[PDB]
Structure 1
Amino acid sequence: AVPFVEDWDLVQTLGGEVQLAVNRVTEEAVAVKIVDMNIKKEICINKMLNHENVVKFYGHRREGNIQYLFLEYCSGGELFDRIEPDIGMPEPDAQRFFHQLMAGVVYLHGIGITHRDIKPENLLLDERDNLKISDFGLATVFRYNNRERLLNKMCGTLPYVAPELLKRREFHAEPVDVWSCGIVLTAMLAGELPWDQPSDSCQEYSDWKEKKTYLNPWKKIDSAPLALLHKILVENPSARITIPDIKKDRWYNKPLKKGAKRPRVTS
């Protein structure tokens, strides 16, 4: 209808490659994922998605052997850059980001999708610091026609992967995403990852199973969120807390965080 409304200028590299695109007419900002030929499954999964804590998918264009993915631009950047090394962030900010992460994950599991690579690099923030789950490149459908299929593929990032992925041939999808959410929560509250990987050979992982919480990173975390981490970072995935029970947790429901300060005057 309106000329040049389909034209986007690529103005900067955000993170294949991810570039910030600005509309020539409306000045609307979107993120364009350029993939030089996993991607067929990524587009298919992105077409199913519609939630306030999941990166929006606007559409895709194919120019020969190159795939263009038009995705939500999040001006707040990555959650990763809000974590101060060896410190973390204020507990009320981490609680709010954790609430929004749980809302995103509940939505994905509800439509039978597992992300499989939850980590602060894949959690983006909008202009109002709302968390958005990003990159469905490793995501897969674990429930179809109300039938659950057990996973067996090695996917993810070692410091965030659940121990069953390294020890068992097959495993349920949902406890794997719950575990990575617990590692994200640890990182937000301590500014450090507890272990290189969740194996008996890793001293830090053995110390946690022996409840040595007087050591780092656990010593930096208050007893209320630490009690929640004791229920998430459980080696047996069948005994691990589920998201309905995380929503009933005492720290999860603890009042800590004030709303965004809103302009006010006196007298």
Structure 2
Amino acid sequence: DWDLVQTLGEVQLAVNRVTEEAVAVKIVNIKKEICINKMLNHENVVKFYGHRREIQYLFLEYCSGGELFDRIEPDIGMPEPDAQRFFHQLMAGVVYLHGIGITHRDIKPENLLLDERDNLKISDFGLATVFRYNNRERLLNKMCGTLPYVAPELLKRREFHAEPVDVWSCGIVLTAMLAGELPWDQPSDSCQEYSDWKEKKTYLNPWKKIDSAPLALLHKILVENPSARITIPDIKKDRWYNKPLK
């Protein structure tokens, strides 16, 4: 038996009556979240233990470290070495997902959990979907995600590639980690902060608070044209991405 100890997000912390093991139980599209979870097995992805239908119950990893969101100090961010480490682990998780043809679609600090060792884990696959199957890519056309984190093509195009969208959102997460703020309400031309970035006014916040090395990476990630946007394999060759830090 598991005792429901407290509400995490519904989602509640459950604790094993015998072993005292802790798990997160999700109490409830749900069919796809379960299916997708069944496919997942990676150290930077929230573990899926199983499910039960009574109201549906999902048994997920308890990440006692909390949400990445709470490691970001407003207007400050966090130490660059910690940001880099979290970004490495995020890429590892995203790489894995894309490798098996899954796109998360809602990457943001609220959905990035930390275990007891502060290892990052991608959470919440309620919006995730298959973008590659039998080695054939399917373009996406449904709008979803979270405005400050979504790529501009999603607002501007009828169809778009899945992967560059996840890459973009990772770029926004990195920005948040290094500056403790989001660069814009949304990646649209009616958005002054977004226009300023497109005009490379990096003497303005949040870019001003970001060292030139990571900023160079951001210049490559937050590129409006998804076809010109840096890919993960190339992120792996980026100077800052490879810089020894602490």
Common fold by TM > 0.5: yes
Task: Provide the rounded CA distance (Å) in 2 between the counterparts of 1:62 and 1:149.
Answer: 31
Task: Provide the rounded CA distance (Å) in 1 between the counterparts of 2:203 and 2:94.
Answer: 31
Structure 1 equivalent of residue 44 of structure 2 = 53
**Per-residue deviation, 1:75:** 0.3
- Greater C-alpha Rg: 1
Task: Provide the rounded CA distance (Å) in 1 between the counterparts of 2:131 and 2:212.
Answer: 34
Equivalent residue of 1:200, what SS?
coil
**Per-residue deviation, 1:248:** 0.2
Residue-by-residue CA offset, 1:157-212 (whole Å, 9 max, x unaligned): 00000000000000000000000000000000000000000000000000000000
Residue-by-residue CA offset, 1:19-52 (whole Å, 9 max, x unaligned): 00000111000000111xx100000000000000
**Per-residue deviation, 1:134:** 0.1
**Per-residue deviation, 1:144:** 0.5
Task: Provide the rounded CA distance (Å) in 2 between the counterparts of 1:207 and 1:244.
Answer: 28
Residue-by-residue CA offset, 1:5-28 (whole Å, 9 max, x unaligned): xx00000111x8110000011100
Residue-by-residue CA offset, 1:91-127 (whole Å, 9 max, x unaligned): 0000000000000000000000000000000000000
Structure 2 equivalent of residue 39 of structure 1 = 30
Task: Provide the rounded CA distance (Å) in 1 between the counterparts of 2:78 and 2:87.
Answer: 12
Equivalent residue of 2:52, what SS?
strand
Structure 1 segments unaligned to the other structure (5+ residues): 1-6, 257-266
Task: Provide the rounded CA distance (Å) in 2 between the counterparts of 1:243 and 1:147.
Answer: 19
**Per-residue deviation, 1:152:** 0.2
Task: Provide the rounded CA distance (Å) in 2 between the counterparts of 1:86 and 1:39.
Answer: 36
**Per-residue deviation, 1:73:** 0.1
Structure 2 equivalent of residue 159 of structure 1 = 148
Equivalent residue of 2:170, what SS?
helix
Task: Provide the rounded CA distance (Å) in 1 between the counterparts of 2:226 and 2:124.
Answer: 25
Structure 2 equivalent of residue 259 of structure 1 = none
Task: Provide the rounded CA distance (Å) in 2 between the counterparts of 1:175 and 1:113.
Answer: 13
**Per-residue deviation, 1:130:** 0.1
Structure 1 equivalent of residue 86 of structure 2 = 97
Structure 1 equivalent of residue 12 of structure 2 = 19
**Per-residue deviation, 1:143:** 0.3
Residue-by-residue CA offset, 1:223-251 (whole Å, 9 max, x unaligned): 00000000000000000000000000000
Residue-by-residue CA offset, 1:60-90 (whole Å, 9 max, x unaligned): 0111xx0000000000000000000000000
Equivalent residue of 2:118, what SS?
coil
Equivalent residue of 1:109, what SS?
helix
Give aligned-pair identity as a percent.
100
Task: Provide the rounded CA distance (Å) in 1 between the counterparts of 2:184 and 2:21.
Answer: 41
Task: Provide the rounded CA distance (Å) in 2 between the counterparts of 1:217 and 1:107.
Answer: 30
Task: Provide the rounded CA distance (Å) in 2 between the counterparts of 1:157 and 1:143.
Answer: 23
Task: Provide the rounded CA distance (Å) in 1 between the counterparts of 2:52 and 2:43.
Answer: 24
Equivalent residue of 2:237, what SS?
coil
Task: Provide the rounded CA distance (Å) in 2 between the counterparts of 1:39 and 1:164.
Answer: 27
Instruction: Determine whether 1:248 maps to 2:237.
Output: yes
Task: Provide the rounded CA distance (Å) in 1 between the counterparts of 2:244 and 2:174.
Answer: 17
Q: Which has the higher helix share?
A: 2
Task: Provide the rounded CA distance (Å) in 2 between the counterparts of 1:104 and 1:248.
Answer: 17
Residue number among 225, 228, 231 corresponding to 1:239 in the alignment: 228
Residue number among 186, 191, 201 corresponding to 1:197 in the alignment: 186
Task: Provide the rounded CA distance (Å) in 2 between the counterparts of 1:74 and 1:151.
Answer: 31
Instruction: Determine whether 1:10 maps to 2:4.
Output: yes
